[PDB]
């Protein structure tokens, strides 16, 4: 891929994040650009998007609920 196309694709990637983050805001997804960009990367690498949405939901629960994080650890250690 020649320099012009690489530069155009890098510029379009940035517009993609801008567009998708504005969509995410309209939908009230509570995603910041950092999390959105990570998700974009995983989805572009083949991750199932319904599973990734569950991942985001569960990580949010664990980050807000020390009871559930410690329960997760107890289940993990028991395996």
């Amino acid at each position: 891929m020649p320099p012009s196309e690489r530069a155009e694709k890098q510029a379009a990637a940035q517009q993609a994040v801008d567009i998708l983050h504005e969509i995410a805001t309209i939908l009230n997804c509570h995603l910041d650009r950092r999390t959105l960009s990570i998700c974009i990367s995983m989805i572009e690498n083949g991750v199932n998007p319904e599973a990734l949405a569950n991942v985001i939901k569960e990580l949010r629960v664990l980050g807000q609920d020390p009871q559930q994080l410690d329960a997760l650890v107890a289940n993990y250690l028991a395996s």
Binding site: A16, N28, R34, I43, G46, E50, L52, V55, L72
Partner: protein, 105 residues
């Protein structure tokens, strides 16, 4: 599929865990044990088969959602969707929009 991308996916998972689960982000033993437990959960979640998602499917779900929630920006979403489709980047636009629809609140 994720075949051949396991390294880049796991690096992203590491980043997600540190960003979204602060108690799992530190350097002490307990935080690192929490990180491993969270990592194992994420891996299991991403293996789950999920539904038959069939594309205008996610965008149609988002539009019909936006007539109930928040009709003032339905047109704005439609213009954003059109712009996105024209970009010469991203091979899985349908799935990113599906992700947003699932997280919509």
């Amino acid at each position: 599929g994720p075949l051949g991308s396991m390294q880049r996916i796991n690096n992203a998972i590491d980043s997600l865990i540190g960003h979204l689960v602060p108690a799992a982000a530190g350097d002490d033993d307990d935080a690192r044990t929490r990180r491993q437990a969270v990592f194992d959960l994420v891996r299991a979640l991403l293996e789950q088969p999920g539904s038959n998602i069939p594309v205008n499917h996610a965008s149609d779900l988002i539009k019909r959602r936006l007539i109930s929630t928040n009709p003032s920006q339905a047109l704005r979403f439609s213009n954003l969707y059109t712009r996105l489709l024209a970009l010469p980047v991203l091979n899985q636009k349908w799935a990113i929009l599906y992700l947003l629809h699932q997280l919509a609140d």
